[PDB]
Design a protein around this ligand. Structure first.
Ligand SMILES: [Mg+2]
Ligand SMILES: [Mg+2]
Ligand SMILES: [Mg+2]
Ligand SMILES: [Mg+2]
Ligand SMILES: [Mg+2]
Ligand SMILES: [Mg+2]
Ligand SMILES: [Mg+2]
Ligand SMILES: [Mg+2]
Lengths: 127, 206, 151, 114, 99, 100, 79
RNA sequence: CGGUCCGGCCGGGAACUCAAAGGAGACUGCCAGUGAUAAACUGGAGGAAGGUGGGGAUGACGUCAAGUCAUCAUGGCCCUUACGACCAGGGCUACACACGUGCUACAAUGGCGCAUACAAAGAGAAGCGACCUCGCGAGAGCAAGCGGACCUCAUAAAGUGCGUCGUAGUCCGGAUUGGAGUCUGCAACUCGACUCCAUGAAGUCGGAAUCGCUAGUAAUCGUGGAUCAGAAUGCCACGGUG
């Protein structure tokens, strides 16, 4: 049976299905390299496989919608770790310390009446 | 500073809507104007019937008015007569067929609208504003209000410089969304212009 | 900061070298939240500096930063109707930040063709302790040693 | 080389150099190098005299330079002689196409006088 | 085939009460029912200046939430059809049937 | 607004439904008909002899309670001021002050 | 400006141009149709084009064809 | 899992994403230090969230005869064959100037070309309008679907890839003007928006002085809405990188 983890960030949400055997990664039917043109973001999906060790140990099959580049990569990061903990849960202490268990709650702040943005205030003239 | 309308802020929380029909954008405006024309009609004809509140809903191709009144016999008239004649002209104004419901206002001195109108009508009679207010407060409390205030504004007693004045007994937590606060309004058209009356009544919480 | 003291956000390390320091650098060079394009310019400048100047990429960085790092500075102050200039001994963490910041600013105020070439030549100049950024440290000291009396 | 303008295009990429002519922006320049049979990123070098006079031939089809300037001035003169709103605007050094003058009409008005 | 009812209203507690009525009625009258499913709420919004003259930054921000329910009825057993079809439902609920 | 300004709208509404519902539609279609009467239609002339107040674009949305030609909202048929006053008394169904 | 299908002109002024043609010219023609397009059959006449307050005599000309009548009747006095 | 038009597409599956109605959860509760064994603070654990977690609504008694008689209402006053009322054209858009708020720039952290990955939130029947076809184009003809988690507006742009320009008033910038057109509308002269061709101003980072912002903020990138026949650089709202 599959071991699963949901992850989300900003307006993104990544589903993450774990199974043993290899260093394979398929996001939205596409390869890790193909999906993310940025190699840094590639590293974050790999991270949950650092403290927790996969080389050719388990398959992660994933998908995601919503948000953008780093939102989708953060969300997948998050969902993997949940799927790792699903597999043991002992692993956590490592994952906690990593900062990877937490759901980063920082959403974009709404645009408010009388202001140019969420906080940017119209330039003030004294006279 | 400016205070938020205490009926408005509590809609959905502890205060009901007075119009509660559904309608798509097509006819929402038409419905809303039709509501205005009926409330206006009824509010005039029943001016001396102590009408405190008119609920309107629109089931299917219908409209049914509920007239909350402290004087039901007046509104109804001998054996249904006055109800009926109202119905026949509501239905005209409304377009669709019409039904009228009548709900007793048991204790009007706890009804902010009839309190406010009562003071309004009293200023027009030439009663003194401190009296009228203070009768309202005293009455409201001896009947079990947790609190009440009534305000009066503009040219009290025909004074050249306009004034605002209020009295307040008991408790009126306006910042408590939980608080059953019954708030309403009335204008006194006097020989020296308009005197606005605001009224708040606290009836307990949740 | 009248009442509320704070800690400081502890940014992730540079993706390539795993350095928090270079993360402080890319961010400082970054503009309009273009992180992707910021680190591209920092590396190519480090790559230009590394390849053809004796390598040791992290160390090359330090040799240059070692030179623009300021030990003391002045903090303006208004006492009895007078704006006195009090020379303050500055703390290590910021010491790096000023050092990095003046290197970045001197790079954009340069004639070369791209920010990467500019950045590279600023580091090189700083590495040999010369150029604008080093000179920024020296003015800080000339200005500091002058008001040595009021420390 | 020189072309209908009797102007001398720079030495560097062709599609941009043709822009040097007056009455030839990018759309014409692209179309001509294409209407000739040349590559757009070629310099004057190797673009031989046989290939340059075959370009003169293609550009010859447009009114350009003195011919175009005359043609442009005369169109303005017309408005002015005609006595219409547009013409009065040209003759009064103010903007022709409706733009405000209470403030900011300054390209047309020229730098300000106190 | 199937009869599906779309329910929309401005008030939620009142909409699913009307939903509850229908489903139960169906379930009792031996109809088979898919749902009720919550279909996304379409909330209009309005921003209006709060002062009668000038003060452009002073505004009220209103919204009307429109709630949606899908009631899907598998078997149209006539008793069910009569059961449903003279139910007494909240006036402020708009009811649509698909056939 | 002025009684006379309100009256003007009603005249305009009436004319718009009388003429520029159907007759103007036909004339517009016929001016617009590419395939036929490319030269002698005369429709463009007749569209002009019609009352101006027959064109719908001549109509202006006004607060139905006061006549205000500014700050109008099609949803309610009112200006923001009367929208709010009706809103706070709870006379606009479904509507309340919203935050998010 | 106007789409190529239809050149615009007020009727009342057009018929005015007709009668002025056949019956020989008169004194100025009084018109408010600043919007109507000048036609070749106006070349010769003098149309008096309103400018808000007065009617400007305009000696129509070959080059005026296609233009608007209002283009020749300044509406704002700038001194 | 069965089936292959390799399309969740049809059987189905009800798991997961999401939808939305109800519920749990966070209280200095726990441990440690500081602090008069106090309140409180600080650090750590557990935890998605830690010290009012983040954002909003919520604005006390009152101050400024502050703003609105032009939203409406209204005391007093004033006009009434005119201060009311109808129509056409014009004006509110003027232009020696000055100030306030903005947009777009001066450029290689960039411009251009080709290719290409990832949003959120709204709007829609006198409406949103696909596909097809014609036009370089704005658009036009033809014509489905949809009162919408179904159809349409609608291809996000930043970014990444390759190539080019090589520090120049330029392959920067787009003002202004000529020519020719599109659509809305009885009607685009005064004064609409947009397109094609040509034009290519000032501007190479702004004196004195001065404003915003403490975190998913600033900065930057696109997206939608109200009003609205048409007319957004304004306003209100949305998420991307950060
Ligand atoms: Mg040129
Ligand atoms: Mg009036
Ligand atoms: Mg209009
Ligand atoms: Mg909930
Ligand atoms: Mg509070
Ligand atoms: Mg005053
Ligand atoms: Mg350009
Ligand atoms: Mg703050």
């Amino acid at each position: 049976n599959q071991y699963y983890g949901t992850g989300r960030r900003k307006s993104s949400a990544a589903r993450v299905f774990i199974k043993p055997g290899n260093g394979k990664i398929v996001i939205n039917q596409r390869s890790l390299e193909q999906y993310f043109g940025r190699e840094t973001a590639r590293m974050v999906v790999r991270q949950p496989l650092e403290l927790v060790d996969m080389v050719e140990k388990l398959d992660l099959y994933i998908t995601v919608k919503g948000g953008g580049i780093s939102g989708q990569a953060g969300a997948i990061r998050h969902g993997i770790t949940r799927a790792l903990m699903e597999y043991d849960e002992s692993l956590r202490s490592e994952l906690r310390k990593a900062g990877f268990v937490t759901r980063d709650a920082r959403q974009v702040e709404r645009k408010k009446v009388g202001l140019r943005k969420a906080r940017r205030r119209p330039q003030f003239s004294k006279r | 500073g400016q205070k938020v309308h205490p009926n408005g802020i509590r809609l959905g929380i502890v205060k009901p809507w007075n119009s509660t029909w559904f309608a798509n954008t097509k006819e929402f405006a038409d419905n809303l104007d039709s509501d205005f024309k009926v409330r206006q009609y009824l509010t005039k004809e029943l001016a001396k019937a102590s009408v405190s509140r008119i609920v309107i809903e629109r089931p299917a191709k219908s409209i049914r008015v509920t007239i909350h009144t402290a004087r039901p016999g007046i509104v109804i008239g001998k054996k249904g007569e006055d109800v009926e004649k109202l119905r026949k002209v509501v239905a005209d104004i409304a377009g669709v067929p019409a039904q009228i419901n009548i709900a007793e206002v048991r204790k009007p001195e706890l009804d902010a609208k009839l309190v406010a109108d009562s003071i309004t009508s009293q200023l027009e009679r030439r009663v003194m504003f401190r009296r009228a207010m203070k009768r309202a407060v005293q009455n409201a409390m001896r009947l079990g209000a947790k609190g009440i205030k009534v305000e009066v504004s503009g040219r009290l007693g025909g004074a050249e410089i306009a004034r605002t004045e209020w009295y307040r007994e008991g408790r009126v937590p306006l910042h408590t969304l939980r608080a059953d606060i019954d708030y309403n309004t009335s204008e006194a058209h006097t020989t020296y212009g308009v005197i606005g009356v605001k009224v708040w009544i606290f009836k307990g919480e949740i | 900061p009248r009442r509320r003291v704070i800690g400081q956000r502890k940014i992730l390390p540079d993706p390539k070298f795993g350095s928090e320091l270079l993360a402080k650098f890319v961010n400082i060079l970054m503009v309009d939240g273009k992180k992707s394009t910021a680190e591209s310019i920092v590396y190519s400048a480090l790559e230009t500096l590394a390849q053809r100047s004796g390598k040791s990429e992290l160390e090359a960085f330090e040799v240059a930063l070692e030179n623009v790092r300021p030990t003391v500075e002045v903090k303006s102050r208004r006492v009895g109707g007078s704006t006195y200039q009090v020379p303050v001994e500055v703390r290590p963490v910021r010491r790096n930040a000023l050092a990095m910041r003046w290197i970045v600013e001197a790079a954009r105020k340069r004639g070369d063709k791209s920010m990467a070439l500019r950045l590279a030549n600023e580091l090189s100049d700083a590495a040999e302790n010369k150029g604008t950024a080093v000179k920024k440290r020296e003015d800080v000291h000339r200005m500091a040693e002058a008001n040595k009396a009021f420390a | 080389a020189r072309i209908a303008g009797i102007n001398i295009p720079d030495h560097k990429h062709a599609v941009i150099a043709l822009t040097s002519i007056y009455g030839v922006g990018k759309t014409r320049s692209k179309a001509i190098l294409a209407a000739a049979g040349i590559a757009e990123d070629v310099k004057i070098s190797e673009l031989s005299e046989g290939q340059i006079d075959t370009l003169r031939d293609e550009v010859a089809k447009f009114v350009v330079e003195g011919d175009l300037r005359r043609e442009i001035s005369m169109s303005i003169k017309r408005l002015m002689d005609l006595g219409c709103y547009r013409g009065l605007r040209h003759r009064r050094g103010l903007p022709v196409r409706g733009q405000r003058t209470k403030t900011n009409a300054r390209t047309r008005k020229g730098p300000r006088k106190p | 085939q199937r009869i599906r009812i779309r329910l929309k209203a401005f008030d939620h507690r009142l909409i699913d009460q009307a939903t509850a009525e229908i489903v139960e009625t169906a379930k009792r009258t031996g109809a088979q029912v898919r749902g009720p499913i919550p279909l996304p709420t379409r909330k209009e919004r309005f921003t209006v200046l709060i002062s009668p003259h000038v003060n452009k930054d002073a505004r009220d921000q209103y919204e009307i939430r429109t709630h949606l329910r899908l009631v899907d009825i598998v078997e149209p057993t006539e008793k069910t059809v009569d059961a449903l079809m003279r139910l007494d439902l909240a006036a402020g609920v708009d009811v649509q049937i698909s056939l | 607004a002025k009684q006379s300004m309100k009256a003007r709208e009603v005249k305009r509404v009436a004319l718009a439904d009388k003429y520029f519902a159907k007759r103007a539609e036909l004339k517009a279609i016929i001016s617009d008909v590419n395939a036929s009467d490319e030269d002698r239609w005369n429709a463009v002339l007749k569209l002009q002899t019609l009352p101006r107040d027959s064109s719908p674009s001549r109509q202006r949305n006004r607060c139905r309670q006061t006549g205000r030609p500014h700050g109008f909202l099609r949803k309610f048929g009112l200006s923001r001021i009367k929208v709010r006053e009706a809103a706070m008394r709870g006379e606009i169904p479904g509507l309340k002050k919203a935050s998010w | 400006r106007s789409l190529k299908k239809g050149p615009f002109i007020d009727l009342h002024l057009l018929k005015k141009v007709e009668k002025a043609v056949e019956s020989g010219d008169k004194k100025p023609l009084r018109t408010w149709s600043r919007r109507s397009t000048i036609f070749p059959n106006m070349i010769g006449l003098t149309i008096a084009v309103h400018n808000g307050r007065q009617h400007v005599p305009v000696f129509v000309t070959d080059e005026m064809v296609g233009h608007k009548l209002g283009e020749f009747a300044p509406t704002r006095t700038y001194r």
